[PDB]
Design a protein around this ligand. Structure first.
Ligand SMILES: O=P(O)(O)OC[C@@H](O)[C@@H](O)[C@@H](O)COP(=O)(O)OC[C@@H](O[C@@H]1O[C@@H](CO)[C@H](O)[C@@H](O)[C@@H]1O)[C@@H](O)[C@@H](O)COP(=O)(O)OC[C@@H](O)[C@@H](O)[C@@H](O)COP(=O)(O)OC[C@@H](O)[C@@H](O)[C@@H](O)CO
Ligand SMILES: O=c1ccn([C@@H]2O[C@H](COP(=O)(O)OP(=O)(O)O)[C@@H](O)[C@H]2O)c(=O)[nH]1
Ligand SMILES: [Cl-]
Length: 492
Protein backbone atom coordinates (compact mmCIF):
# COMPACT_ATOMS: atom_id res chain seq x y z
CA UNK A 1 0.00 0.00 0.00
CA UNK A 2 0.99 3.74 0.01
CA UNK A 3 2.92 4.77 3.20
CA UNK A 4 3.17 8.57 3.89
CA UNK A 5 5.87 10.34 6.00
CA UNK A 6 5.02 13.82 7.44
CA UNK A 7 8.16 15.97 8.17
CA UNK A 8 8.47 18.47 11.11
CA UNK A 9 11.25 19.54 13.58
CA UNK A 10 9.45 18.88 16.95
CA UNK A 11 6.15 17.50 18.39
CA UNK A 12 5.35 18.85 21.93
CA UNK A 13 1.99 19.11 23.84
CA UNK A 14 1.59 22.97 23.80
CA UNK A 15 1.64 23.43 19.95
CA UNK A 16 -0.67 25.09 17.32
CA UNK A 17 -2.28 24.48 13.88
CA UNK A 18 0.37 22.67 11.74
CA UNK A 19 0.65 19.95 14.48
CA UNK A 20 -3.17 19.33 14.79
CA UNK A 21 -3.52 19.36 10.93
CA UNK A 22 -0.72 16.73 10.42
CA UNK A 23 -2.13 14.43 13.18
CA UNK A 24 -5.77 14.81 11.89
CA UNK A 25 -4.44 14.12 8.33
CA UNK A 26 -2.70 10.95 9.69
CA UNK A 27 -5.91 9.66 11.42
CA UNK A 28 -8.10 10.22 8.28
CA UNK A 29 -5.27 8.74 6.11
CA UNK A 30 -5.08 5.62 8.39
CA UNK A 31 -8.94 5.36 8.17
CA UNK A 32 -8.43 5.17 4.34
CA UNK A 33 -5.79 2.33 4.55
CA UNK A 34 -2.95 4.91 3.98
CA UNK A 35 -0.16 4.83 6.66
CA UNK A 36 0.53 8.31 8.18
CA UNK A 37 3.80 8.65 10.19
CA UNK A 38 5.40 11.86 11.61
CA UNK A 39 9.22 12.37 11.22
CA UNK A 40 10.62 14.67 14.00
CA UNK A 41 14.34 15.72 14.20
CA UNK A 42 14.80 16.79 17.89
CA UNK A 43 16.14 15.19 21.12
CA UNK A 44 13.32 14.68 23.68
CA UNK A 45 14.01 12.00 26.37
CA UNK A 46 10.28 12.20 27.38
CA UNK A 47 9.00 11.74 23.76
CA UNK A 48 7.11 8.52 24.77
CA UNK A 49 5.31 10.41 27.63
CA UNK A 50 4.60 13.46 25.34
CA UNK A 51 3.09 11.23 22.56
CA UNK A 52 1.12 9.28 25.27
CA UNK A 53 -0.38 12.58 26.61
CA UNK A 54 -1.12 13.58 22.95
CA UNK A 55 -3.02 10.29 22.21
CA UNK A 56 -4.77 10.45 25.67
CA UNK A 57 -5.86 14.10 24.94
CA UNK A 58 -7.47 12.86 21.64
CA UNK A 59 -4.90 14.90 19.59
CA UNK A 60 -3.15 11.87 17.93
CA UNK A 61 -4.36 8.43 16.66
CA UNK A 62 -2.84 5.27 18.30
CA UNK A 63 -1.90 3.98 14.78
CA UNK A 64 0.33 7.11 14.26
CA UNK A 65 4.07 6.36 14.80
CA UNK A 66 6.64 9.19 15.31
CA UNK A 67 10.16 8.70 13.80
CA UNK A 68 13.30 10.47 15.17
CA UNK A 69 17.02 10.01 14.28
CA UNK A 70 17.82 10.21 18.06
CA UNK A 71 15.67 7.01 18.46
CA UNK A 72 16.41 5.16 15.14
CA UNK A 73 20.25 5.32 15.53
CA UNK A 74 19.93 4.75 19.34
CA UNK A 75 18.16 1.39 18.58
CA UNK A 76 20.94 0.42 16.05
CA UNK A 77 23.62 1.25 18.73
CA UNK A 78 21.72 -0.97 21.25
CA UNK A 79 22.20 -3.93 18.81
CA UNK A 80 26.03 -3.40 18.57
CA UNK A 81 26.68 -4.32 22.29
CA UNK A 82 25.09 -6.69 24.88
CA UNK A 83 25.75 -5.26 28.42
CA UNK A 84 25.69 -1.76 30.05
CA UNK A 85 29.10 0.05 29.96
CA UNK A 86 28.63 1.78 33.40
CA UNK A 87 32.11 3.34 32.71
CA UNK A 88 30.95 7.02 32.48
CA UNK A 89 28.73 6.30 35.56
CA UNK A 90 31.75 4.82 37.47
CA UNK A 91 33.83 7.93 36.47
CA UNK A 92 31.26 10.38 37.98
CA UNK A 93 30.72 8.05 41.02
CA UNK A 94 34.51 8.01 41.76
CA UNK A 95 34.70 11.85 41.24
CA UNK A 96 31.74 12.32 43.68
CA UNK A 97 33.92 10.15 46.01
CA UNK A 98 37.01 11.79 47.68
CA UNK A 99 34.62 14.85 47.65
CA UNK A 100 32.30 16.23 50.42
CA UNK A 101 28.50 16.50 49.76
CA UNK A 102 27.50 20.11 50.72
CA UNK A 103 23.68 20.01 50.16
CA UNK A 104 21.95 23.45 49.81
CA UNK A 105 18.42 21.89 49.52
CA UNK A 106 17.08 18.26 49.35
CA UNK A 107 17.61 18.40 45.52
CA UNK A 108 20.62 20.77 44.96
CA UNK A 109 24.01 19.58 46.38
CA UNK A 110 27.70 20.58 45.76
CA UNK A 111 30.88 18.40 45.99
CA UNK A 112 34.29 19.68 47.29
CA UNK A 113 37.43 17.54 46.60
CA UNK A 114 40.33 18.68 48.90
CA UNK A 115 42.72 17.32 46.18
CA UNK A 116 41.03 19.68 43.61
CA UNK A 117 40.90 22.42 46.36
CA UNK A 118 37.53 23.66 44.88
CA UNK A 119 33.85 22.71 44.19
CA UNK A 120 34.19 20.59 40.98
CA UNK A 121 30.56 19.26 40.83
CA UNK A 122 26.89 20.33 41.36
CA UNK A 123 23.84 17.97 41.44
CA UNK A 124 20.05 18.49 41.04
CA UNK A 125 18.14 15.23 41.81
CA UNK A 126 14.42 15.52 40.81
CA UNK A 127 11.59 12.88 40.80
CA UNK A 128 12.38 11.61 37.23
CA UNK A 129 15.79 13.16 36.24
CA UNK A 130 19.20 13.82 37.95
CA UNK A 131 21.44 16.65 36.59
CA UNK A 132 25.25 16.80 37.22
CA UNK A 133 26.85 20.18 36.31
CA UNK A 134 30.69 19.83 36.44
CA UNK A 135 32.89 22.86 37.38
CA UNK A 136 36.61 23.81 37.01
CA UNK A 137 37.95 27.18 38.37
CA UNK A 138 34.28 28.08 39.22
CA UNK A 139 33.36 27.73 35.48
CA UNK A 140 30.75 25.13 34.31
CA UNK A 141 32.16 23.03 31.38
CA UNK A 142 29.99 19.83 31.44
CA UNK A 143 26.37 18.73 32.22
CA UNK A 144 25.55 14.99 32.78
CA UNK A 145 21.77 14.34 32.29
CA UNK A 146 20.46 11.13 33.99
CA UNK A 147 16.92 10.04 32.89
CA UNK A 148 15.18 6.83 34.18
CA UNK A 149 18.45 5.79 35.96
CA UNK A 150 20.65 5.98 32.80
CA UNK A 151 23.00 8.64 31.26
CA UNK A 152 21.04 9.88 28.16
CA UNK A 153 22.73 13.22 27.21
CA UNK A 154 25.86 15.30 28.08
CA UNK A 155 26.45 19.01 27.20
CA UNK A 156 29.89 20.76 26.90
CA UNK A 157 29.89 24.57 27.59
CA UNK A 158 32.64 27.25 27.15
CA UNK A 159 34.03 30.06 29.42
CA UNK A 160 30.98 32.29 28.57
CA UNK A 161 28.83 29.21 29.59
CA UNK A 162 27.51 28.80 25.97
CA UNK A 163 26.84 25.25 24.57
CA UNK A 164 29.66 24.21 22.13
CA UNK A 165 29.05 20.39 22.07
CA UNK A 166 26.21 17.84 22.70
CA UNK A 167 26.62 14.03 23.23
CA UNK A 168 23.84 11.34 23.17
CA UNK A 169 24.24 7.88 24.88
CA UNK A 170 22.17 4.69 24.21
CA UNK A 171 20.43 2.13 26.55
CA UNK A 172 23.69 0.06 26.83
CA UNK A 173 25.51 3.25 28.06
CA UNK A 174 27.42 3.98 24.78
CA UNK A 175 27.74 7.31 22.87
CA UNK A 176 26.19 6.93 19.34
CA UNK A 177 25.91 10.67 18.42
CA UNK A 178 28.23 13.71 19.01
CA UNK A 179 27.23 17.25 17.83
CA UNK A 180 29.26 20.51 17.61
CA UNK A 181 27.27 23.74 18.37
CA UNK A 182 28.35 27.17 16.99
CA UNK A 183 27.69 29.50 19.99
CA UNK A 184 27.92 32.68 17.78
CA UNK A 185 25.51 31.56 14.97
CA UNK A 186 23.57 29.53 17.63
CA UNK A 187 23.52 26.63 15.07
CA UNK A 188 24.43 22.87 14.79
CA UNK A 189 27.72 21.79 13.07
CA UNK A 190 29.84 18.58 12.81
CA UNK A 191 27.41 15.68 13.61
CA UNK A 192 29.28 12.39 14.43
CA UNK A 193 27.43 9.02 14.06
CA UNK A 194 29.87 6.98 16.25
CA UNK A 195 27.61 3.86 15.85
CA UNK A 196 28.33 3.88 12.04
CA UNK A 197 31.66 5.87 12.24
CA UNK A 198 30.08 8.47 9.85
CA UNK A 199 30.68 12.29 9.83
CA UNK A 200 28.19 15.05 8.75
CA UNK A 201 28.81 18.86 8.53
CA UNK A 202 25.18 19.89 9.38
CA UNK A 203 22.05 18.35 11.01
CA UNK A 204 20.56 18.71 7.45
CA UNK A 205 22.98 15.95 6.19
CA UNK A 206 22.42 13.77 9.33
CA UNK A 207 18.58 13.99 9.01
CA UNK A 208 18.77 13.44 5.19
CA UNK A 209 20.85 10.27 5.92
CA UNK A 210 18.22 9.24 8.54
CA UNK A 211 15.39 9.66 5.93
CA UNK A 212 17.53 7.81 3.28
CA UNK A 213 17.76 4.84 5.75
CA UNK A 214 14.29 4.90 7.46
CA UNK A 215 12.30 5.51 4.19
CA UNK A 216 13.22 3.06 1.36
CA UNK A 217 13.40 4.38 -2.28
CA UNK A 218 9.97 2.99 -3.41
CA UNK A 219 7.24 4.78 -5.49
CA UNK A 220 4.58 3.60 -2.94
CA UNK A 221 6.37 5.79 -0.29
CA UNK A 222 5.67 9.60 -0.10
CA UNK A 223 7.24 12.42 2.04
CA UNK A 224 4.93 15.34 3.09
CA UNK A 225 7.08 18.21 4.53
CA UNK A 226 4.65 20.47 6.52
CA UNK A 227 7.50 22.35 8.33
CA UNK A 228 9.06 25.14 6.17
CA UNK A 229 12.48 24.83 7.96
CA UNK A 230 12.72 21.02 7.40
CA UNK A 231 12.34 21.34 3.55
CA UNK A 232 16.14 21.65 2.86
CA UNK A 233 16.85 18.25 4.59
CA UNK A 234 14.08 16.51 2.49
CA UNK A 235 15.42 18.13 -0.76
CA UNK A 236 18.99 16.76 -0.21
CA UNK A 237 17.91 13.05 -0.06
CA UNK A 238 19.32 10.32 -2.41
CA UNK A 239 15.71 9.14 -3.20
CA UNK A 240 14.76 8.95 -6.94
CA UNK A 241 11.37 7.12 -6.54
CA UNK A 242 9.93 8.45 -3.18
CA UNK A 243 7.32 11.21 -3.94
CA UNK A 244 8.00 14.56 -2.14
CA UNK A 245 5.12 17.02 -1.37
CA UNK A 246 5.57 20.37 0.48
CA UNK A 247 2.71 22.15 2.37
CA UNK A 248 2.56 25.97 2.94
CA UNK A 249 0.72 26.38 6.32
CA UNK A 250 0.98 30.25 6.52
CA UNK A 251 1.08 33.49 4.41
CA UNK A 252 4.19 33.21 2.13
CA UNK A 253 4.77 37.03 2.46
CA UNK A 254 6.98 38.76 5.12
CA UNK A 255 4.87 38.99 8.35
CA UNK A 256 4.99 42.86 8.48
CA UNK A 257 6.76 44.14 5.29
CA UNK A 258 3.92 44.85 2.75
CA UNK A 259 6.61 45.37 0.00
CA UNK A 260 5.70 41.90 -1.42
CA UNK A 261 8.89 40.36 0.08
CA UNK A 262 8.58 36.54 0.66
CA UNK A 263 9.92 34.59 3.71
CA UNK A 264 13.30 32.83 3.00
CA UNK A 265 11.97 29.38 4.16
CA UNK A 266 8.75 29.65 2.03
CA UNK A 267 10.68 31.21 -0.94
CA UNK A 268 13.12 28.20 -0.81
CA UNK A 269 10.15 25.72 -1.04
CA UNK A 270 8.40 27.72 -3.84
CA UNK A 271 11.74 28.11 -5.77
CA UNK A 272 12.84 24.40 -5.58
CA UNK A 273 9.35 23.13 -6.65
CA UNK A 274 10.75 21.74 -9.97
CA UNK A 275 12.89 19.31 -7.85
CA UNK A 276 9.84 18.04 -5.80
CA UNK A 277 6.59 16.31 -6.98
CA UNK A 278 4.35 19.31 -6.00
CA UNK A 279 3.47 22.06 -3.44
CA UNK A 280 0.08 21.88 -1.58
CA UNK A 281 -1.61 25.19 -0.54
CA UNK A 282 -4.81 25.45 1.61
CA UNK A 283 -6.58 28.39 -0.20
CA UNK A 284 -6.80 29.12 -3.98
CA UNK A 285 -5.89 32.74 -2.99
CA UNK A 286 -2.39 31.56 -1.88
CA UNK A 287 -2.02 29.36 -5.04
CA UNK A 288 -2.78 32.43 -7.27
CA UNK A 289 -0.42 34.88 -5.44
CA UNK A 290 2.35 32.16 -5.54
CA UNK A 291 1.79 31.23 -9.25
CA UNK A 292 2.68 34.94 -9.83
CA UNK A 293 6.52 35.46 -9.65
CA UNK A 294 7.21 31.64 -9.43
CA UNK A 295 5.35 30.17 -12.50
CA UNK A 296 5.17 26.79 -10.62
CA UNK A 297 3.14 24.26 -12.74
CA UNK A 298 2.84 21.76 -9.81
CA UNK A 299 0.61 23.70 -7.32
CA UNK A 300 -2.36 21.96 -5.55
CA UNK A 301 -5.18 23.56 -3.42
CA UNK A 302 -5.81 20.45 -1.19
CA UNK A 303 -7.09 22.02 2.11
CA UNK A 304 -6.36 20.77 5.70
CA UNK A 305 -8.39 17.90 7.30
CA UNK A 306 -10.68 19.15 10.15
CA UNK A 307 -12.20 16.59 12.61
CA UNK A 308 -16.03 16.99 12.25
CA UNK A 309 -16.91 16.67 16.01
CA UNK A 310 -20.49 15.43 16.75
CA UNK A 311 -23.34 17.98 17.36
CA UNK A 312 -24.52 18.90 20.92
CA UNK A 313 -27.05 21.02 22.92
CA UNK A 314 -25.75 24.65 22.62
CA UNK A 315 -28.02 26.93 24.75
CA UNK A 316 -25.61 29.94 24.34
CA UNK A 317 -26.37 31.03 27.97
CA UNK A 318 -22.90 32.58 28.71
CA UNK A 319 -21.81 36.00 27.27
CA UNK A 320 -18.12 35.03 26.61
CA UNK A 321 -15.95 35.73 23.49
CA UNK A 322 -12.96 33.35 22.97
CA UNK A 323 -9.54 33.42 21.19
CA UNK A 324 -7.91 29.93 21.56
CA UNK A 325 -4.50 30.43 19.81
CA UNK A 326 -0.73 30.87 20.52
CA UNK A 327 0.13 34.17 22.32
CA UNK A 328 2.23 35.23 19.26
CA UNK A 329 2.26 38.56 17.28
CA UNK A 330 0.81 36.60 14.25
CA UNK A 331 -2.57 37.07 16.07
CA UNK A 332 -3.29 40.82 16.60
CA UNK A 333 -3.77 40.61 20.44
CA UNK A 334 -3.28 44.45 20.68
CA UNK A 335 -6.26 45.11 18.28
CA UNK A 336 -8.32 42.50 20.27
CA UNK A 337 -7.86 44.47 23.57
CA UNK A 338 -8.64 47.72 21.64
CA UNK A 339 -12.02 46.12 20.62
CA UNK A 340 -12.68 44.53 24.08
CA UNK A 341 -12.61 48.05 25.68
CA UNK A 342 -15.30 49.15 23.12
CA UNK A 343 -17.46 46.04 23.93
CA UNK A 344 -17.06 46.56 27.75
CA UNK A 345 -17.91 50.31 27.28
CA UNK A 346 -21.42 49.10 26.16
CA UNK A 347 -21.79 45.68 27.94
CA UNK A 348 -19.32 45.48 30.90
CA UNK A 349 -20.71 41.92 31.58
CA UNK A 350 -19.15 40.42 28.35
CA UNK A 351 -15.96 38.43 29.28
CA UNK A 352 -13.05 37.81 26.81
CA UNK A 353 -11.67 34.36 27.85
CA UNK A 354 -8.38 34.08 25.83
CA UNK A 355 -6.73 30.58 25.75
CA UNK A 356 -3.23 29.43 24.63
CA UNK A 357 0.42 30.07 25.71
CA UNK A 358 3.24 32.11 24.04
CA UNK A 359 5.77 34.99 24.36
CA UNK A 360 3.25 37.94 24.20
CA UNK A 361 1.60 36.86 27.54
CA UNK A 362 3.42 39.68 29.48
CA UNK A 363 2.61 42.22 26.68
CA UNK A 364 -1.18 41.40 26.57
CA UNK A 365 -1.34 41.35 30.44
CA UNK A 366 0.27 44.87 30.49
CA UNK A 367 -2.43 46.24 28.08
CA UNK A 368 -5.11 44.38 30.16
CA UNK A 369 -3.78 46.09 33.37
CA UNK A 370 -3.33 49.49 31.55
CA UNK A 371 -7.12 49.48 30.83
CA UNK A 372 -9.90 48.44 33.31
CA UNK A 373 -10.10 45.11 31.34
CA UNK A 374 -8.78 43.01 34.32
CA UNK A 375 -12.28 41.55 35.10
CA UNK A 376 -13.26 41.41 31.35
CA UNK A 377 -10.24 40.26 29.23
CA UNK A 378 -8.61 37.29 31.09
CA UNK A 379 -5.87 34.92 29.76
CA UNK A 380 -6.54 31.36 31.11
CA UNK A 381 -3.65 29.42 29.42
CA UNK A 382 -3.18 26.42 27.05
CA UNK A 383 -6.21 24.04 26.91
CA UNK A 384 -5.82 20.32 25.97
CA UNK A 385 -9.67 20.20 25.55
CA UNK A 386 -10.53 23.39 23.56
CA UNK A 387 -13.77 21.60 22.39
CA UNK A 388 -15.26 21.88 25.96
CA UNK A 389 -14.11 25.57 26.24
CA UNK A 390 -15.66 26.57 22.83
CA UNK A 391 -18.87 24.60 23.69
CA UNK A 392 -19.31 27.09 26.62
CA UNK A 393 -18.73 30.24 24.44
CA UNK A 394 -21.03 32.78 22.67
CA UNK A 395 -18.83 33.96 19.73
CA UNK A 396 -15.20 33.47 18.52
CA UNK A 397 -13.07 36.48 17.35
CA UNK A 398 -9.93 36.70 15.12
CA UNK A 399 -7.67 39.82 15.02
CA UNK A 400 -4.91 38.10 12.92
CA UNK A 401 -2.87 40.18 10.39
CA UNK A 402 -1.63 36.99 8.59
CA UNK A 403 -2.69 33.27 8.75
CA UNK A 404 -3.30 30.02 6.74
CA UNK A 405 -6.48 27.84 6.91
CA UNK A 406 -7.50 29.02 10.45
CA UNK A 407 -8.27 25.71 12.26
CA UNK A 408 -9.47 27.32 15.58
CA UNK A 409 -12.21 29.35 13.76
CA UNK A 410 -13.28 26.32 11.61
CA UNK A 411 -13.55 24.09 14.77
CA UNK A 412 -15.62 26.86 16.49
CA UNK A 413 -17.99 27.04 13.45
CA UNK A 414 -18.25 23.17 13.55
CA UNK A 415 -19.20 23.45 17.30
CA UNK A 416 -22.19 25.66 16.21
CA UNK A 417 -20.40 28.92 17.26
CA UNK A 418 -20.72 32.24 15.32
CA UNK A 419 -17.28 33.63 14.24
CA UNK A 420 -16.44 37.36 13.66
CA UNK A 421 -12.97 37.58 12.01
CA UNK A 422 -10.74 40.27 10.38
CA UNK A 423 -10.61 39.67 6.57
CA UNK A 424 -6.97 38.40 6.34
CA UNK A 425 -4.88 37.18 3.33
CA UNK A 426 -4.99 33.43 2.40
CA UNK A 427 -7.30 32.70 5.39
CA UNK A 428 -10.92 33.05 6.60
CA UNK A 429 -12.03 34.77 3.31
CA UNK A 430 -13.01 31.23 2.07
CA UNK A 431 -15.39 29.99 4.87
CA UNK A 432 -16.68 33.12 6.78
CA UNK A 433 -19.90 34.33 5.02
CA UNK A 434 -21.02 37.82 6.27
CA UNK A 435 -24.55 37.22 7.71
CA UNK A 436 -24.73 33.39 7.21
CA UNK A 437 -22.19 31.91 9.73
CA UNK A 438 -20.75 35.20 11.14
CA UNK A 439 -19.38 38.64 10.09
CA UNK A 440 -16.18 39.22 8.01
CA UNK A 441 -14.74 42.59 9.25
CA UNK A 442 -12.06 44.71 7.42
CA UNK A 443 -8.52 44.37 8.94
CA UNK A 444 -7.94 47.04 11.69
CA UNK A 445 -11.68 48.04 11.90
CA UNK A 446 -12.22 47.78 15.72
CA UNK A 447 -15.58 49.69 15.47
CA UNK A 448 -17.29 47.20 13.05
CA UNK A 449 -15.76 44.12 14.82
CA UNK A 450 -17.06 45.35 18.25
CA UNK A 451 -20.57 46.17 16.84
CA UNK A 452 -20.88 42.58 15.42
CA UNK A 453 -19.63 41.06 18.75
CA UNK A 454 -22.24 43.28 20.55
CA UNK A 455 -25.13 42.09 18.27
CA UNK A 456 -24.23 38.39 19.00
CA UNK A 457 -23.79 38.99 22.80
CA UNK A 458 -27.33 40.54 22.86
CA UNK A 459 -29.02 38.11 20.36
CA UNK A 460 -28.29 34.50 21.53
CA UNK A 461 -30.97 33.37 18.97
CA UNK A 462 -28.97 34.76 15.96
CA UNK A 463 -25.74 33.31 17.53
CA UNK A 464 -27.20 29.73 17.38
CA UNK A 465 -28.66 30.38 13.86
CA UNK A 466 -25.26 31.65 12.51
CA UNK A 467 -23.43 28.77 14.31
CA UNK A 468 -25.73 26.14 12.69
CA UNK A 469 -24.82 27.48 9.18
CA UNK A 470 -21.11 27.48 10.24
CA UNK A 471 -21.12 23.71 11.01
CA UNK A 472 -22.82 22.91 7.64
CA UNK A 473 -20.38 25.37 5.90
CA UNK A 474 -17.38 23.25 7.11
CA UNK A 475 -19.13 19.88 6.36
CA UNK A 476 -19.94 20.89 2.71
CA UNK A 477 -16.52 22.52 1.95
CA UNK A 478 -13.97 20.46 4.00
CA UNK A 479 -15.45 16.92 3.72
CA UNK A 480 -12.71 14.47 4.89
CA UNK A 481 -13.60 12.12 1.95
CA UNK A 482 -13.21 15.01 -0.60
CA UNK A 483 -9.76 16.03 0.81
CA UNK A 484 -8.55 12.36 0.83
CA UNK A 485 -9.54 11.87 -2.88
CA UNK A 486 -7.39 14.97 -3.73
CA UNK A 487 -4.42 13.53 -1.70
CA UNK A 488 -4.78 10.04 -3.32
CA UNK A 489 -4.77 11.79 -6.78
CA UNK A 490 -1.34 13.42 -6.05
CA UNK A 491 -0.07 10.06 -4.60
CA UNK A 492 -0.97 7.98 -7.72
O1 LIG B 1 20.34 23.19 11.92
P1 LIG B 1 19.02 23.12 11.00
O2 LIG B 1 18.72 21.54 10.78
O3 LIG B 1 19.21 23.85 9.73
O4 LIG B 1 17.84 23.69 11.91
C1 LIG B 1 17.37 25.01 11.68
C2 LIG B 1 16.39 25.43 12.78
O5 LIG B 1 15.94 26.76 12.52
C3 LIG B 1 15.18 24.48 12.83
O6 LIG B 1 14.84 24.27 14.20
C4 LIG B 1 13.99 25.08 12.09
O7 LIG B 1 14.23 25.02 10.69
C5 LIG B 1 12.73 24.29 12.44
O8 LIG B 1 12.21 23.70 11.26
P2 LIG B 1 10.62 23.63 11.01
O9 LIG B 1 10.15 24.74 10.15
O10 LIG B 1 10.37 22.19 10.33
O11 LIG B 1 9.92 23.57 12.44
C6 LIG B 1 8.61 24.09 12.58
C7 LIG B 1 8.38 24.35 14.06
O12 LIG B 1 9.25 25.39 14.51
C8 LIG B 1 8.79 26.77 14.43
O13 LIG B 1 9.13 27.36 13.17
C9 LIG B 1 10.55 27.35 12.97
C10 LIG B 1 10.87 27.88 11.58
O14 LIG B 1 10.92 29.31 11.61
C11 LIG B 1 11.22 28.20 14.04
O15 LIG B 1 12.63 28.22 13.82
C12 LIG B 1 10.92 27.60 15.38
O16 LIG B 1 11.48 28.42 16.40
C13 LIG B 1 9.42 27.55 15.56
O17 LIG B 1 9.11 26.90 16.80
C14 LIG B 1 6.90 24.68 14.32
O18 LIG B 1 6.31 25.30 13.17
C15 LIG B 1 6.14 23.39 14.62
O19 LIG B 1 6.97 22.51 15.36
C16 LIG B 1 4.91 23.70 15.45
O20 LIG B 1 3.88 24.17 14.60
P3 LIG B 1 2.56 24.76 15.27
O21 LIG B 1 1.39 23.88 15.03
O22 LIG B 1 2.85 24.87 16.87
O23 LIG B 1 2.43 26.27 14.76
C17 LIG B 1 1.57 26.61 13.67
C18 LIG B 1 2.38 27.19 12.52
O24 LIG B 1 1.56 27.28 11.36
C19 LIG B 1 2.88 28.58 12.91
O25 LIG B 1 4.02 28.46 13.75
C20 LIG B 1 3.27 29.34 11.65
O26 LIG B 1 2.11 29.99 11.13
C21 LIG B 1 4.31 30.38 12.02
O27 LIG B 1 4.29 31.42 11.06
P4 LIG B 1 5.68 31.96 10.44
O28 LIG B 1 5.32 33.37 9.74
O29 LIG B 1 6.29 30.97 9.52
O30 LIG B 1 6.65 32.24 11.69
C22 LIG B 1 6.88 33.55 12.21
C23 LIG B 1 8.38 33.77 12.31
O31 LIG B 1 8.95 32.69 13.06
C24 LIG B 1 9.05 33.79 10.93
O32 LIG B 1 8.18 34.38 9.95
C25 LIG B 1 10.33 34.61 11.02
O33 LIG B 1 11.21 34.02 11.99
C26 LIG B 1 11.03 34.64 9.66
O34 LIG B 1 10.46 35.68 8.86
O1 LIG C 1 -4.43 26.40 23.83
C1 LIG C 1 -4.56 26.00 22.66
C2 LIG C 1 -4.26 26.83 21.59
C3 LIG C 1 -4.42 26.37 20.29
N1 LIG C 1 -4.85 25.12 20.10
C4 LIG C 1 -5.02 24.60 18.74
O2 LIG C 1 -4.19 25.30 17.82
C5 LIG C 1 -4.85 25.42 16.56
C6 LIG C 1 -4.81 26.86 16.07
O3 LIG C 1 -4.51 26.83 14.68
P1 LIG C 1 -4.67 28.15 13.76
O4 LIG C 1 -4.69 27.70 12.32
O5 LIG C 1 -5.85 28.94 14.27
O6 LIG C 1 -3.34 29.04 14.05
P2 LIG C 1 -1.80 28.56 13.91
O7 LIG C 1 -1.49 27.87 15.22
O8 LIG C 1 -1.73 27.65 12.70
O9 LIG C 1 -1.04 29.85 13.73
C7 LIG C 1 -6.26 24.91 16.74
O10 LIG C 1 -6.38 23.64 16.10
C8 LIG C 1 -6.43 24.76 18.24
O11 LIG C 1 -7.22 23.61 18.56
C9 LIG C 1 -5.15 24.29 21.21
O12 LIG C 1 -5.55 23.12 21.05
N2 LIG C 1 -4.99 24.75 22.45
CL1 LIG D 1 29.96 -6.78 24.63
Amino acid sequence: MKQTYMIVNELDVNKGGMTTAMLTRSKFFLDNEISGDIITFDFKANYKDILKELVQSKKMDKRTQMHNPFIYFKNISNLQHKKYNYTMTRNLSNLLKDSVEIKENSRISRFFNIMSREYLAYKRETEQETIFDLFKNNLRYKRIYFYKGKIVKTEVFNSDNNLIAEQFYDDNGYLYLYRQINPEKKSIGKTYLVCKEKQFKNNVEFCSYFLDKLIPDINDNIIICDGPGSFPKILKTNHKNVKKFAVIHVNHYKNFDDTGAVKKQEDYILRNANKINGVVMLTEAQKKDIIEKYKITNAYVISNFINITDDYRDKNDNKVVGHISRLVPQKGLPYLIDVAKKVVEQDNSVEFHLYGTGEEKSKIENLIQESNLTNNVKLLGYTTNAIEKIKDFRCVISTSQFEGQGLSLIEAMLLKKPVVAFDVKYGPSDFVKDGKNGYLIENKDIKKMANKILKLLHDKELSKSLGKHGRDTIIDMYQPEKLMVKWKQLFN
